[PDB]
Ligand binder design. Structure first.
Ligand SMILES: *CC(=O)Nc1ccc(-c2nc3ccccn3c2Nc2c(C)cc(O)cc2C)cc1
Ligand SMILES: *CC(=O)Nc1ccc(-c2nc3ccccn3c2Nc2c(C)cc(O)cc2C)cc1
Ligand SMILES: [Ca+2]
Ligand SMILES: [Ca+2]
Ligand SMILES: [Ca+2]
Ligand SMILES: [Ca+2]
Ligand SMILES: [Ca+2]
Ligand SMILES: [Ca+2]
Ligand SMILES: [Ca+2]
Ligand SMILES: [Ca+2]
Ligand SMILES: [Cl-]
Ligand SMILES: [Cl-]
Ligand SMILES: [Mg+2]
Ligand SMILES: [Mg+2]
Ligand SMILES: [Mg+2]
Ligand SMILES: [Mg+2]
Lengths: 5, 236, 236, 5
């Protein structure tokens, strides 16, 4: 999965 | 509400204790109670709210993905019929997840966003609105899926517009918003080119503004810039 | 009970799904429902029950320790008065932990232990009884602390007596029981010499019986033997 | 903390 904050 | 009898300051204090104890459900309940006192939240308090719910929904999303994968495998050719239990349990977790999202969106709508006038607060809350609609979109399969996606898009876009006008390109809130909206484009809106363009432009415009920053601000901004780079590396 | 309408087999199936999804509270609720159907549990089912509650109470114990440490520091000389919140929240977590222990002990008493006649089942359940009284003892500070400790001791001792008569010294249940009773001696009963003696004798008697085992049984037994060695290394 | 199972 891609990075989120 | 069960937190109605507890002082605002005590709820904040206990949210911080819950974080230390990795008790994120408790942390979220304390912060919900604090929001429902009706006063605006400080920067620190906004981040307590976000950390709490991010951890709760993060765990639900991870569980939902495990169960969805099992369910998908059950509907492949040659898979033995095991009954309704996988679907039921995936639905149970999904309903819980949707409930948490609805809770967060409810707090934002009643009345955090409408009282947020400073860019830092308003962008933060609109990013949250986009994020929690995005989580609803991840599990949506019905007649309202398009509307859920558009709700996420709209919230992110309003946040983007404010952030570009009112914040420097290195501002961590602005950077994190762009990171997440880029992921929305890639994973939800079937728009990988938009995702890549946004991540690249955001990274490059931040790079050009790093020279203005203190050592500590530089550290904060470059950390998020690396996440943009990580996604670009994944996608290209 | 909320699980009263769900089939036993469906509860077991969903406990396994919950484990895969790391949803241990759900797993425990499913297994409680399965126990309350009133039928005895198979080996696999007993292990589902234990895994679920071990994970739930394990998280509570970790949180309680964090909060207890903060509370202890607050009562040192020179510490600023912060009000009742640390104590309150530690008490909240403690009460939840005690509730889970009472739930497990309730299942054992109604009626898992009394229907368990085979050594493998009876020892397993009596070990569980000792463990959950041990967890109650960890947080006990009142008039009943001695009785709680003695309840743990008594359950462990009955399990030990059966295990020594009915199981080989390499049996994983026997080994795990001895490991945990040794920890009881060290951490709860203020009996480090007894803890060390038990761990050493258990290890040595298992070592002497390894020659009787298959490759797979050898792997299982040596894994637990290493835990005994690890504790001995910590304590000597 | 010591090991238990
Ligand atoms: C006042 C305010 O909101 N300031 C703020 C909040 C959050 C961050 C932040 N710093 C780091 C470092 C590593 C990973 C994540 N984060 C965050 N998280 C967020 C970011 C980057 C952006 C938004 O919009 C929200 C959050 C929670 C820095 C400064
Ligand atoms: C039928 C039965 O109960 N058999 C059984 C249960 C549990 C184990 C076991 N194997 C391993 C390996 C590494 C760490 C822990 N464990 C366990 N756990 C237990 C042990 C060793 C002893 C007792 O009494 C209970 C448990 C849950 C092996 C065989
Ligand atoms: Ca088949
Ligand atoms: Ca089935
Ligand atoms: Ca659904
Ligand atoms: Ca305002
Ligand atoms: Ca002072
Ligand atoms: Ca206080
Ligand atoms: Ca108490
Ligand atoms: Ca029986
Ligand atoms: Cl279910
Ligand atoms: Cl509390
Ligand atoms: Mg007040
Ligand atoms: Mg644009
Ligand atoms: Mg039936
Ligand atoms: Mg003895």
């Amino acid at each position: 999965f891609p990075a989120t904050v | 509400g069960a937190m109605g009898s507890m002082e605002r300051a005590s709820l904040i204090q206990k949210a911080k204790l819950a974080e230390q104890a990795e008790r994120y459900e408790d942390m979220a309940a304390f912060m919900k109670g604090a929001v429902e006192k009706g006063e605006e939240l400080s920067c620190e308090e906004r981040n307590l709210l976000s950390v709490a719910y991010k951890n709760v929904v993060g765990g639900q999303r991870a569980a939902w993905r495990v169960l969805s994968s099992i369910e998908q495998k059950s509907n492949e050719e040659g898979s033995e019929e095991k009954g309704p239990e996988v679907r039921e349990y995936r639905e149970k977790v999904e309903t819980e997840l949707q409930g948490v999202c609805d809770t967060v969106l409810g707090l934002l709508d009643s009345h955090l966003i409408k009282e947020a006038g400073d860019a830092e607060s308003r962008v933060f809350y609109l990013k949250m609105k986009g994020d929690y609609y995005r989580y609803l979109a991840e599990v949506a399969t019905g007649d309202d899926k398009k509307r859920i996606i558009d709700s996420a898009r709209s919230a992110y876009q309003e946040a983007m517009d404010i952030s570009k006008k009112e914040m420097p390109p290195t501002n961590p809130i602005r950077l994190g918003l762009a990171l997440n909206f880029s992921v929305f484009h890639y994973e939800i809106a079937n728009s990988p080119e938009e995702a890549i363009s946004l991540a690249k432009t955001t990274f490059d415009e931040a790079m050009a503004d790093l020279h203005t920053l203190s050592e500590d601000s530089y550290k904060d901004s470059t950390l998020i810039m690396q996440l943009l780079r990580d996604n670009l590396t994944l996608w290209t």
